[PDB]
Amino acid sequence: MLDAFAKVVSQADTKGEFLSSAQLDALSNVVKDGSKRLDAVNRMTSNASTIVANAARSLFEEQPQLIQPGGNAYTNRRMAACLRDMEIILRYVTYATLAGDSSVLDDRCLNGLRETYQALGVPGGSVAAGVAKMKDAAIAIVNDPNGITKGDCSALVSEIASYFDRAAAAVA
C-alpha cells in the first residue's frame, strides 16, 4: 500500500529524479494539514455507529422495500450483514484518509467488490447510495465546528468525499 509520501517517492524513483519543488510543496501542505487529518480520522472513528446509522436510515426511508419482507436488508441476518458492510467501507475510508492515498481502499476493499455483490444478489446501486449517505453524514461530523480549533478543512473534506465517491462508484 501507498501513502501520499510513498506515492510521490515511487514516481520519482521510476523517473530517477529528485523531488520537484511542486512535489515538495504538495507534501509540505499535507504535513501542515496533518493535525486536521487526525481530527478527521478520529471523528469518523469515534462516531462510526452514528455515521452508519444516519446512512442506513436515509437509505431505508428512500428505499423502504429493503426493510420489508423479502427485502435484501430484511431479517436479522441480512440487516447485521448490511451494517457490517457499511462499517467496513467506512473503515477503509478512514485508512485512505489517514494515508492521503486511496491505494489501501482500492486494493483491500473495492477491488472486485462489485462482482462479489452481483454474485450474492446484493443491490450494488443500493450499496452505492448507502455509501453516498455515509459521505454526507461523515462530512457533517468532520466539519462540526464545536469543540475544535476553528480553521479551513475544505481541502481535506474534498479528499474524504473523493474516497467515498470512489467507494460508491466501485459498486454502482
Binding site: A6, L24, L27, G34
Partner: protein, 162 residues
C-alpha cells in the same frame, strides 16, 4: 512501500478494526517530525549539486590515489569523475526519498539491497561513499531537528556501508 503510516494501517487492517488511539499517537509522532524531515529534504534537494560536488572533492582529497592512479574504477579522468558524482547523487537522492517518506524504506529498497554486490563487482571502496556521506552530514547547513533528521538517514546509509 513501508512508512510509519502504512505500518499502522496494515496493523489495524490485519485485525480488521479501526485505528486505535495508540496508532493515532504514533502517526502524530510522524506528523510532528515531518516538518523537520521536510525541511531537511528541501535543503538537500536545493543544494544537491553543491553537496554532490563537495562530497566528491572531499573523497578526492581524502583518498588522493582516486584521482591519480589509472583504472576504470578510479576517477582519474573525466569519465570516472562523472560516474563518481552520479553515484553520490544516487545516495543523496535516495536519502531525500527516506526523509520524505519518514522511514528507512526507500533506502532499504532503492539503495542498500544489492549495494554490496555492486561495490564488490566494480571494485568501488565503500569507504569512499562513507567519506562523501560524512561530508554531506558535516556540511548540509541544517540546524535543530532538521539536522537531526538528515543526520539519522545519512548515518543509516553510512552504517549500511559498514
Amino acid at each position: 512501500m513501508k512508512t510509519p503510516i502504512t505500518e499502522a494501517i496494515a496493523a489495524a487492517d490485519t485485525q480488521g478494526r479501526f485505528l486505535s488511539n495508540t496508532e493515532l499517537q504514533a502517526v502524530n509522532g510522524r506528523f510532528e517530525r515531518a516538518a523537520a524531515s521536510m525541511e531537511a529534504a528541501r535543503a538537500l534537494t536545493n543544494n544537491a549539486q553543491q553537496l554532490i560536488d563537495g562530497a566528491a572533492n572531499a573523497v578526492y582529497q581524502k583518498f588522493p590515489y582516486t584521482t591519480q592512479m589509472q583504472g576504470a574504477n578510479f576517477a582519474s579522468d573525466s569519465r570516472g569523475k562523472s560516474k563518481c558524482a552520479r553515484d553520490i547523487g544516487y545516495y543523496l537522492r535516495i536519502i531525500t526519498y527516506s526523509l520524505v517518506a519518514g522511514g528507512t524504506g526507500p533506502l532499504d529498497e532503492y539503495l542498500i539491497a544489492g549495494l554490496d554486490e555492486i561495490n564488490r563487482t566494480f571494485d568501488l571502496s565503500p569507504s569512499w561513499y562513507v567519506e562523501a556521506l560524512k561530508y554531506i552530514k558535516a556540511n548540509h547547513g541544517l540546524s535543530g531537528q532538521a539536522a537531526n533528521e538528515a543526520n539519522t538517514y545519512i548515518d543509516y546509509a553510512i552504517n549500511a556501508l559498514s
